[model samples]
Target chain A: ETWRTNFYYNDVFTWSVADAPGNILYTVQHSPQNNPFTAVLSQMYAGWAGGMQFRFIVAGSGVFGGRLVAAVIPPGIEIGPGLEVRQFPHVVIDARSLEPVTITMPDLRPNMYHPTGNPGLVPTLVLSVYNNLINPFGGSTSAIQVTVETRPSEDFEFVMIRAPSSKTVDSISPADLLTTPVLTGVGTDNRWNGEIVGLQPVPGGFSTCNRHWNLNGSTYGWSSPRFAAIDHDRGNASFPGSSSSNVLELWYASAGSAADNPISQIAPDGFPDMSFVPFSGITIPTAGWVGFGGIWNSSNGAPYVTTMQAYELGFATGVPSNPQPTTTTSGAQIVAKSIYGVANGINQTTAGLFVMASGVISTPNSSATTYTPQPNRIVNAPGTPAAAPIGKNTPIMFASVVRRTGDINAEAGSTNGTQYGAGSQPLPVTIGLSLNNYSSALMPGQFFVWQLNFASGFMELGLSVDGYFYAGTGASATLIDLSDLVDIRPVGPRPSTSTLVYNL
Target chain B: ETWRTNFYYNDVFTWSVADAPGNILYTVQHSPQNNPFTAVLSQMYAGWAGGMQFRFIVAGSGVFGGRLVAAVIPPGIEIGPGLEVRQFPHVVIDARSLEPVTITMPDLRPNMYHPTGNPGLVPTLVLSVYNNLINPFGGSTSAIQVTVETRPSEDFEFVMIRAPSSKT
Candidate 1:
């Protein structure tokens, strides 16, 4: 289901201590130009025991040609521990006219020592890159050639996941796996029950945010206090109070394991491994922000050590899987079926709730009812009453983050700072149905209802029901337990009724 | 696409034609707690020889009330080269204030060989219930109850998938 490809490298970059003192230690240059594309690079670590500095150099087209930008870790600095790890967020270049940018490592250290678990003494500068590039969707006429340079003993690797020709390259951002809200109280008592909800407001007036944490010890690390459980209800939780900045932490193994032997460790090549994976995810901030870190460790006697060098976080807009809220008029539909019926002919009806489509409920006509008339109804069944029956008058069961005319005051500063009251001080970016009326008769049992609005993003719908059957003439009605018959796949957003039918 | 309640009963019953003194043997019975409901009983084997027989039982006040009809199996009974199993097609019921009727086992067989891989030595008789209860969506009070009893000591499990209470 993922369209983005992952890339990595494994090999030591070597240099003589006497010759590694100035700018342009080594340059990775590609000729003949490449196509315009977005690229993200995460460096594991770079530099020697002494120090090192590097920068990205560009050539070809517009103002970016011949320009130079510093790498994540500032050049000419000694990085021991507790230093900021820098990853260039994302860059878009029209390589069709511009040559591939060159990266130069200014200084390289040769002071190498084999750690207890590793194979041999190696060069000081060891760097890994996780590169993801998107094809121009639909298929492209041109290809980009990107290459890196290595000395006689240097090493490098790249892995990728690309989209098929049928899919267009939407947008690519840092994979926001935590982009959607989490489900609570699910799969309990074989009922598969829960509510589809959204993120909660955190401290400092921000709806959601994430931070980093670190731990140093001789023993293998643990994601305990550093990677804390989030009590999304901010005001009620004490530990992660308003003063807490580092609310979450992502940890990766930095040696110690049996697989830490550097020579034998099977590098990710292009696949995901425990070395760099989302260890602890945090809720996404409303306005969105990026957080990253650098971690390194070493034993007292050994000179070389394994390091979880760097991480970067950014929000990608056009990743195909990311939920997008676009204007679509064709709303959701609901269908109802009658449990009691004959073999040849049964009762059924379909209703389309049009909050987003036409803002009108699609009720059933007399002919639309696929069963006989009610026992007490008059002979003239196909009339206005049949056209818009009692159920047709059923109220829409819905709630949203957006404040309608009658919504209650559930905000802190809705009123003056002193008293809480409803106010129109702000607006919401999303709206949704809360599944509160799932148990009602109009939508009996677990069923699927959909929504498509201008601002609110797409919602996945599928649900179950709980009810019983009735017996005759005022006697005690026997309860009939019906389970596991429904399978729901919600309809997606579309522009018109014709498009909606195709999507359905 | 279906709106009928599919109900099933899992149990076994036994009878002797010599003791009953007839070609047909009564195996199960019920009464008092009856509504207009229809039931179809499927046998694992038929005629003590070939051709599996399926019977439809109906009681109460509805079309074809108080009638029992047998279904004609579509000629090709010899399903070649596999495991031995038996089941029946669907039928209807209407148990409107009717008493329990006696269901006869046409021919008694103690040699009830459980299907291969099934852990028992017994007849696997599956009874399904389909009742035309009122449509609650339009507020109809007419109802039906359908059930079948079988021999004790026969293990059983029930699974039901019914439609909603609307769209009458």
Candidate 2:
């Protein structure tokens, strides 16, 4: 019998804003550009609200000028740099569904804040809207109408990272960005630079400060710490950015657009979410979202930042807190104004951020009074931009998305999934859980993935591949060795020892 | 010294369409209920055109429900479920700086000329465009502006293989 592999993880399709009740329509467009979180949105996407809510995070870079502007606008729409969410380390799901919705334009000035440096003049607009529960299963046009507006920036310089093969397909040049020695580092904010340097981590992990990175060169409270592992086989002649995908990047977008599109208006700020943040001074107030979130990078330098106002969504009118009592103890606060920074450089990338009280957000007394991003210049010239070994825009075909999680189906049969730990020293040990109280919700093949690992807490994730079942763990206990893993990294205090199912 | 992990193989994305330029887009968008490719294009991308030509291919249990539809508008535009020169992939690069500009849309589509039971949609598109040799950096949005009229399918279902993921 012929068989193939697949992946299963937790995912949520959100709308341009909060899940406000209303009829919505959505359309999607995407780009394979390196740090593609917002590149796809800069393209064209239109249709209903549901389509805009479902977002995606890709791992490639295309070459669009730092002052990059999208061509397909829906009309009378304005946008900004884009928003950034958490960067999950272990979780792979189908992101193709999350593309940009085309909105026409009335040009919005490219200068938002003068003092804060703009990494790229990226015309990404991140906003919030009511949630779209509608499944993307239906294909219909003219479902709803959405008006888009953008706020441009002067300090930012956005560029598209393309693969080499994609270059061949289109035969575009400046091959150097495709072939030059790129600055591979993280924590564009460079917050933990001093802490992560020369520190001996666990047997496999990096220094403790490596995880909490900042950016550029500002005490704006950013650091340029790096992740512990790397994926050397990222962009080749055949598989651009596919060979390696070990580090977590950022994803940003606008609100009320669609579920699948990237968050609009990302700030040069670092990353957000303290419950997920290993350090303090970084916390995001969310309403309905939990589980895996953030960005992934196959290469270094292409830092993805989100500059949207964070929110702490509500429950189904009394579900007793979104994450339950966890929210209160978690210290989930709505600081209205602040910044979150994240980056990776050379063998040193970091992810963290600082919040400010500017823009249309409401700031609390505890919110940071001021915030700014360090600037990075993106120059254009012959033989510059990097290209993947594969041709440009060439899609890579794979058998599965990978992850580790618990399942409901494990109870019906003894196909117990792999399980790990919250505090196993050198590495967590894998054990099987009894399926005596199998809740149907934990059906076979269903997966739960925690993309970002913060709090050093344990999270039970699910697994699935085309409906096949598997298992993995979260926190510092479980680390997924996906079928495509180039190397195993045990970075941090205790080595995590979680065994994942080959089938998941 | 190293952490533990397990590698599994799987399909991240898949595509299938009838043998036509429009069908190619239809098939891709239909599968994921969204369009993840070529949707992000701009006009300045036109400066990079390599050259323009066209090709056609058809494969599936059924390419169309009825006779193929071909409607031409201008700039050598052709519509229907058959391949055309403009359907192939194209890229754009900066004229002065020499860096990449952007990629053009796919111009080819595969259709079902032969008959088969439980016929699936054609999986490819026929296309032609500025050659990569002449325009090393690729063409701009000019090639796509050709703007052909719709061929109005006699009978068709814009469906494709269920895809999990895709490379851009």
Candidate 3:
């Protein structure tokens, strides 16, 4: 089924303190550039998140040029008698660069979930270079003080991975980082370098690390070791130095794991999460200083990374501790106490049989941290099987067997209702036998019942059953039949396995 | 900690339908070849499943040679009283190939569960063509016609996307 997927939108920008401008700059307007592939105004994605990142160089020597500074302010609300709101304006400034930098502003009006408007509605980014010169002292100069570098070949890449309920994102470690090479730098003026710090991982347990061309010489790659979960910045650790320089840094955010990231589990609606990184094809420029920033109508198509969250099935086994518990096989059939370990809703009724072969069944005196039942069969034919008896862990044959999921029915009967629902936690299952199978001398002083359940598969049903044994006053060993107990809707959805199912 | 990434080793061979050999073919002793990155005697994964698929050219030909013929057979086991077994050799032959044929052999070994090996252990793939000239009636004469195209620049494109437990 094409279940709805949840998602989020985030952005990041990185630069040195040397690229700071004098004051704050605003993105006044931006124009849509023709697609490099088709050279036409691209149709925008009505549901695309209007997100973008701006990278600058502290290039110029004075005023707005040597340091990095940035912020994300929401669309301003003009509150009055009748409140009005202004569109979110792209506003940022480098601590350096005074050479009157210009940038095309993006339309923050339509969010990532807006619907496609009238036909031929080609939404574009308009250009409006903002600086102190454009608006003098303060008015509204849309100069971000950052030069825009449009790389014809490099485009932002977005990839997503999803996991099912049974397998949680928490189990995945940093070792699962899948890296795909996208961009390469060129030019001999490798003096200017950049590093992107505090880079978060992508949702669905994925991240990226750049392979610096001449890293050792540059001494500016990963801060710690490769594949570490926390390190996110990259650039010339020591910028403006020789030997090796020129670099690019992109930051992709993380959305936690299954445990902390509850959205990773099954929800009424597909909870969406998103993570992405940007790429600017512009190589180290001839200006010896390069700043990267641009606006794109993601509404128009771009390269995307898709992750698939899949679900699979698994199984576990359990045995009875007290295989032969005593029971009064007359009058109102006793509901009897319950056992543990049977798969509550997903038990296979047909294969749920009780066989007593000739052998010694040893039961552990103490229980383990995890339930573990061994196979035991004695007296293949339905006659009185040999019993070694138990006091201090003795061998006992023919323990009573019961395999039924718990019956939380309001009334007692074989018709309680359905078992589990689409999103419930697993319930407990039990098993037991009646007294009809007991003889005067062959009666079980005490018997035990084991439990088991089906663990994997999609949309599988969990069921319940009941039965009884008949007998006369102190009679001989006889046959007994099990019956179905009350039932109900499923307790919850499918069981989870350890494997991480992702659709790439 | 650097966890080894598990990978599959698969290979494929293609030929024209008109180039079909008369009898069944079996893979005999095959040698090894190398690419630019590294060269060494590759160790075969003991626990691997072998699978093959055949695609035909339907452009200008009859039924069999132009249609798709596919089958999946799990490796056979010869169980002894003690559960001892041996690996059975594989054998298959197309009804035709002159019209053009395509065969893709993906590594069925090391499955999805193979422990990712050590760090920097760059797993490489190599191919060695082979045939059994031991069938009765036909003497030893290799007649399988094909073209080999080796593009080295197409290598070194490594894309690894790992899912971490959290979005740290």
lDDT by residue for model 2 (B1-168), tens: 011021112112112212221242221111111122211221112111111112112221110111111211222334454544221222111112122122222222334221212222322222221111111123342111111111211232223322234321
Per-candidate DockQ versus the true complex?
A: 0.00, 0.02, 0.02
lDDT per residue for candidate 3 within A266-370, as digits (tens), equals 100111111101112331111000111111112333211111111100011111111121111111110111111111112111111111111111111211111
Leading candidate by TM-score: 2
Model 2 misplaced stretches (Cα beyond 4 Å): A1-18, A21-102, A110-504, B1-168
TM-score of chain A of 2: 0.17
In model 3, which regions exceed 4 Å deviation? Answer: A1-155, A158-504, B1-168
Worst 10 residues of 1 chain A by lDDT: A423-432
What is the RMSD of candidate 1? 36.1
Q: What docking class should model 2 receive?
A: incorrect
Looking at chain B only, the TM-scores across the models are 0.24, 0.16, 0.23
Per-prediction TM-score to the true structure, in the order listed: 0.18, 0.19, 0.17
Model 1, span A1-504: residue lDDT tens: 111121111111212212211222222211101111111211121211221222121111121111112243332445443232224322332322223333333323233421111212322222222222222221221122222322211222122333332222222211221122212212111000112222111111100000101011111111111221111010110111233333321221111121422222221111111111111234221211111122222212221112111122211111222322211111211111111111222111211110110011111211111111112111110111111111111111111122111222422224311111111000110101111121222323222233222122332321112111011112211221112112223342221112111011
Ranking by lDDT: 2, 3, 1
List per-candidate RMSD values in Å. Answer: 36.1, 30.7, 34.1
**Model 1: how many Å of interface RMSD?**
34.0
